[PDB]
Structure formats: structure tokens, C-alpha cells
């Protein structure tokens, strides 16, 4: 046969991300002397909408500690964050909604978002709308902290990783039905070329390992092993179980 | 209960002098034939003295300490009263209702206030009055 559809996405010719209208990469402030030894006050100038992202964006302006200048940062807005609000980021920042603190300096049960996998990567965890990370305990020795991820997995992170207090705004978005293909068309128009999706069983044997036959059926077990090669991983990959 | 007296210091909020500090000289609580509203006669600072250090020369200190005064009638709603005071007995006579509406008399009153204000800056006192408000 020929190269199947999912193999073609790696080259990235027409499957790249549409990033003309993006407002920027939403990242925390760079970890510097002030963050790990105090706090710096910021101002929420405006809250803007980013294409392809359900979560709104917040623009916070800080003052450069080393040069007479003003620095603007793009944050993912949490619930209750309003324009003109002062934002405090650092080790000594008070426990308030919208503040960014290291994970090791907050009590257990605190709700955080935009969490860092490692200290200094400027936010990796809980970035989608309505998601948050629950802190389930600390570990004073060897500087570790245990957190609970939105998928339900428990992870152990260093106490120097930072995160913002609150829940990512824009929650409840996936509760409204799209009700037609037109709204789905505009949804993926701002993200990438992955819609509509054609069923493999409706193709020919050259196109997909499901096509062909006098009846539209798969023919073989759809559970594909983890050890399969490219061109075979179509269907359920390393499925521990199936059914409802 | 009353603070808009003949020696109070206020901050102008509107009209080409916003943010510049003035001192009330002759308040008028209940209107007048002109300006049918609460108003007062004030004298203030338009160009504040510049900072002077120990390295400045003899003539350079004199240039940087020049003060440009101004005399204006201001509405009460266009002022922000402060808690500071300044004695105005030296230049009270030159400023009056007759002083205005006469371009010749406006100029003569300003040079009296300029001399009074400058000599106050020397032998530093009322330092908050001679510092430019930052905004």
C-alpha cells in the first residue's frame, strides 16, 4: 500500500499550527533574584482573548530591577482576576488569588495552576480552562512536594517549582453542544488541519489497514501492540481493556 | 471645621497649572460679581527650583534656584487642600481683586511674589512646597 494518513503528519506540510492571530506564548516570569528572595508587584493592564485557546490571557506589567524600563508578561488568567489588580509573584508573596508562589511555601490543600514541572521552565502543568492541581502534602527533606494532576495521577515535584493560585478561567466550555458542523469547522480553523476525519474502514486497502472488503468491517483485532511499527498503529494502541 | 483660610496650601488640579502647588491668599466663600461660585486668590510655582549639589559652581547654583511664580483665581472644586501652611503676610497686599483685570498690575505683583518666594527657598523651609509633585 501507500503511506497512511497519520504518518503524513510528522513531515508537517499542511498539518502545522495556525499561529497568525496568537497573542504570544503564555509563560511565567523568568526566575530571578527577586522571585526566590522576595516578591515583585505587577499590574493587570488588560485581559485579552487568544485565538485557538479557550482560556483568556492576562497581560501583567512589571518593572525591570536592573534597568529603567517596563516588562510585560503574558499570563493565563485565573478566575476572579480583574484589570487593575495588583499581582505579587515570589517566595514572600502573600497567599492570594492570582499570586505566583513556590509550591513548597503553601499549605496542603491549596489549589494552584500553571505549575512548573521543574524550577525555571515557566509553567507546564494545568494550563487548560477549568483545570487545576491539588497539593496533597510536602516533604521538607530533599526538597520535594507531592501534587495531584487533573488526570488523576500523583506526581512528586521539587519545592522550588512555582505556580499561580486559583483555577484557570473559562471553565464549563465543553458543556455546550456545537450543534452543527459549521461551528466545528471554525473551531479547528484557528488550531490546525485535523478536521473532518475520514473513517479508515471506508477507504481502500491501499489507504488504510481497515479498508477493503465487500462489507465495511475491520476484519482483525483493533488492539495494536506497543511494539508495532509505523503504518500499523491504527486503532486502539496498547489497550489494557476495551468495551463500555 | 474650616480649613480654607488665608494661609493654607493646595494643589491645582485643572487649567494649565494642574499638579502645581499654590497657597491661598484671599478666599471668597460666597461668590462675587464675577465668578459666581466659591473661589480663592492663590499664588504658586510654575517652574520649581532644580536640585543643587556640593559640586555646583557659584553662578550655577543661582541659575538653578530661579523660581517662576504665577497668580490666578481658582475655583474651590479645582483644588486639593493639603495639611501644610505658609505665611503670606509679606506679599498679601500686592495680590487683590484690583490686581487682576489690569495687565500692568498683574506683572508688578508677580515680581513681588517672586522675591518673597525665592528668599524663602534660601535658608530652607517649607521644603514640601518647593518640591515638584511627581505624577
Amino acid at each position: 500500500g501507500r503511506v497512511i494518513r497519520n504518518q503524513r503528519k510528522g513531515a508537517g506540510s499542511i498539518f502545522t499550527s495556525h499561529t497568525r492571530l496568537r497573542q504570544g506564548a503564555a509563560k511565567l516570569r523568568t526566575l530571578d533574584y527577586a522571585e526566590r528572595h522576595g516578591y515583585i508587584r505587577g499590574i493587570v493592564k488588560q485581559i485579552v482573548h487568544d485565538s485557538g485557546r479557550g482560556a483568556p490571557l492576562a497581560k501583567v506589567v512589571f518593572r525591570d530591577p536592573y534597568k529603567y524600563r517596563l516588562r510585560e508578561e503574558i499570563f493565563i488568567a485565573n478566575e476572579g482576576v480583574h484589570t487593575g489588580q495588583f499581582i505579587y509573584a515570589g517566595k514572600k508573596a502573600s497567599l492570594n488569588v492570582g499570586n505566583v508562589l513556590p509550591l513548597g511555601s503553601v499549605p496542603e490543600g491549596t489549589i494552584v495552576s500553571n505549575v512548573e514541572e521543574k524550577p525555571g521552565d515557566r509553567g507546564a502543568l494545568a494550563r487548560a480552562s477549568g483545570n487545576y492541581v491539588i497539593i496533597i502534602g510536602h516533604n521538607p527533606d530533599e526538597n520535594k512536594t507531592r501534587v495531584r494532576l487533573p488526570s488523576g495521577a500523583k506526581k512528586v515535584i521539587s519545592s522550588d517549582a512555582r505556580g499561580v493560585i486559583g483555577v484557570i478561567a473559562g471553565g464549563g466550555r465543553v458543556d455546550k453542544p456545537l450543534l452543527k458542523a459549521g461551528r466545528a469547522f471554525h473551531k479547528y480553523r484557528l488550531k490546525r488541519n485535523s478536521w473532518p476525519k475520514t473513517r479508515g474502514v471506508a477507504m481502500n486497502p491501499v489507504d488504510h489497514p481497515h479498508g477493503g472488503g465487500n462489507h465495511q468491517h475491520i476484519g482483525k483485532a483493533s488492539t495494536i501492540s506497543r511494539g508495532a511499527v509505523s503504518g500499523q498503529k491504527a486503532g486502539l494502541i496498547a489497550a489494557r481493556r476495551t468495551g463500555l | 471645621a474650616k480649613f480654607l483660610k488665608a494661609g493654607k496650601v493646595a494643589v491645582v488640579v485643572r487649567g494649565r497649572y494642574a499638579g502645581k502647588k499654590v497657597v491661598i491668599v484671599k478666599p471668597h466663600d460666597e461668590g462675587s460679581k464675577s465668578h459666581p461660585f466659591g473661589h480663592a486668590l492663590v499664588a504658586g510655582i510654575e517652574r520649581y527650583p532644580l536640585k543643587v549639589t556640593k559640586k555646583h559652581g557659584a553662578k550655577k547654583v543661582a541659575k538653578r534656584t530661579k523660581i517662576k511664580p504665577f497668580i490666578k483665581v481658582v475655583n474651590y472644586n479645582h483644588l486639593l487642600p493639603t495639611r501644610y501652611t505658609l505665611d503670606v503676610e509679606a506679599f498679601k497686599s500686592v495680590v487683590s481683586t484690583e490686581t487682576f483685570e489690569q495687565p500692568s498690575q498683574r506683572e508688578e505683583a508677580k515680581k513681588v511674589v517672586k522675591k518673597a518666594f525665592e528668599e524663602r527657598h534660601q535658608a530652607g523651609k517649607n521644603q514640601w512646597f518647593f518640591s515638584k509633585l511627581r505624577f
Binding site: 527577586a34 515583585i40 525591570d64 | 549639589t53 547654583v61 527657598h121 530652607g124 521644603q127
Partner: peptide, 29 residues
């Protein structure tokens, strides 16, 4: 003397901008 005043600057975190210091230890050689 009456015209000169002592106005110290605060170089703490979030205060006035830091002054020039010796950064020889952090030079990218």
C-alpha cells in the same frame, strides 16, 4: 548647606533600580 539635602536611595527588592556593581564573576567569557 541649606540648599543641599541627604536623600538616600533604597536598593531593596522592588525598590529603586539597582546601581552599577562589579559583575566580573558572571562575565560570559
Amino acid at each position: 548647606n541649606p540648599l543641599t539635602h541627604s536623600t538616600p536611595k533604597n536598593f531593596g527588592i522592588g525598590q529603586a533600580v539597582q546601581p552599577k556593581r562589579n559583575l566580573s564573576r558572571y562575565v560570559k567569557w
